Design an enzyme around this catalytic site. Structure first.
Site, PDB file in Angstrom:
ATOM      1  N   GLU A 190       0.791  -1.246   0.000  1.00 29.96           N
ATOM      2  CA  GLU A 190       0.000   0.000   0.000  1.00 29.96           C
ATOM      3  C   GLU A 190       0.809   1.275   0.000  1.00 29.96           C
ATOM      4  O   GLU A 190       0.277   2.317  -0.397  1.00 29.96           O
ATOM      5  CB  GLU A 190      -0.930   0.042   1.227  1.00 29.96           C
ATOM      6  CG  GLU A 190      -1.939  -1.113   1.302  1.00 29.96           C
ATOM      7  CD  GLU A 190      -3.018  -1.076   0.246  1.00 29.96           C
ATOM      8  OE1 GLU A 190      -3.128  -0.074  -0.534  1.00 29.96           O
ATOM      9  OE2 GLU A 190      -3.783  -2.058   0.177  1.00 29.96           O
ATOM     10  N   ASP A 231      -6.411   6.508  -6.197  1.00 24.00           N
ATOM     11  CA  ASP A 231      -5.854   5.211  -6.584  1.00 24.00           C
ATOM     12  C   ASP A 231      -6.328   4.774  -7.986  1.00 24.00           C
ATOM     13  O   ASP A 231      -7.146   5.469  -8.643  1.00 24.00           O
ATOM     14  CB  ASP A 231      -6.129   4.166  -5.479  1.00 24.00           C
ATOM     15  CG  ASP A 231      -7.515   3.549  -5.547  1.00 24.00           C
ATOM     16  OD1 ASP A 231      -8.361   3.912  -6.398  1.00 24.00           O
ATOM     17  OD2 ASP A 231      -7.766   2.644  -4.716  1.00 24.00           O
TER      18      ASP A 231
END
Ligand SMILES: [Cl-]
Length: 175
Positions: free
Chosen positions: A11, A20
């Site tokens: 992450e 994202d």
């Protein structure tokens, strides 16, 4: 290597809101906030959406953040999110039996998937879950790659899939 270290590698750590690949405003170590509009959307819409993400973050932190947090706050959201992924697996009738059948390293790989895509999403991978429960590792690996998940984040999916294939942390060594 443990689930926290594993997810921190997958992450990353960003202290300001970002978007994202699936178009979700995110912050910290993979903490999902809200959806973003189209890239055309509307100047009006975009501001609105950013403010909705900031509002989500403020609620999560309990402070007026304006979209920026500290490393300690990112680690707090991360602790909560790992806890939530595990609780989600344990409360789910499709995921719990698979999790209980797995060894510790493979359990981390399943928590990683749930952390990324949520309980409902992973619980829907019926064929891969059956293969995992049957310890048909190579078959499971081939099946898991036939997914939007793998096509969208291939390097991360390959690491998670190698973890299910081998039951080792090799894919995270030297990372
Ligand atoms: Cl196999």
């Amino acid at each position: 290597m443990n689930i926290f270290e594993m997810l921190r590698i997958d992450e990353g750590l960003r202290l300001k809101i970002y978007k994202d690949t699936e178009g979700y405003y995110t912050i910290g170590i993979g903490h999902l906030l809200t959806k973003s509009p189209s890239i055309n959307a509307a100047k009006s819409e975009l501001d609105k959406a950013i403010n909705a993400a900031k509002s989500e973050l403020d609620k999560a932190i309990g402070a007026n953040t304006n979209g920026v947090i500290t490393k300690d706050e990112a680690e707090k959201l991360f602790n909560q999110d790992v806890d939530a992924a595990v609780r989600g697996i344990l409360r789910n009738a499709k995921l719990k039996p698979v999790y209980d059948s797995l060894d510790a390293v493979r359990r981390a790989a399943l928590i990683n998937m749930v952390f990324q895509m949520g309980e409902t999403g992973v619980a829907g991978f019926t064929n891969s879950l059956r293969m995992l429960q049957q310890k048909r590792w190579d078959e499971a690996a081939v099946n898991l790659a036939k997914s939007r998940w793998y096509n969208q984040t291939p390097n991360r999916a390959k690491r998670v899939i190698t973890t299910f294939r081998t039951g080792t942390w090799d894919a995270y060594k030297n990372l």
